[PDB]
């Protein structure tokens, strides 16, 4: 899905399609600008059922 539901509840508008780094917990995702940012695995709530 393209939303980032986060531990804060906030719903981030992501170009989606996440890349986790599973060897240490760090998730990459596109932000709107098209930036590929690391956020942590914890810090991930509500994408879609995994």
Known sequence: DYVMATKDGRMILTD???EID???????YHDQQGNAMQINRDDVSQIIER
Do not use: Q
């Open 16 to 18: 989606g399609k996440p």
């Open 22 to 28: 599973d060897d240490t917990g760090l998730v990459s």
